[PDB]
């Protein structure tokens, strides 16, 4: 599962292949927050 997200706090397009959505959800949040604080 291939799952497409921007973060603002960037301006970067990040896309997350992950066999698991269990993996995704971590991935994507975890992408997210460290662009919004790094």
């Given amino acids: 599962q291939c799952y497409t997200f921007r973060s603002e706090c ?4 990040f896309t997350v292949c992950r066999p698991n959505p269990e ?16």
Avoid: L
């Fill in 10 to 13: 960037t301006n970067k397009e």
């Fill in 23 to 38: 993996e995704v959800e971590k991935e994507a949040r975890r992408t997210k927050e460290e662009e919004c604080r790094k």
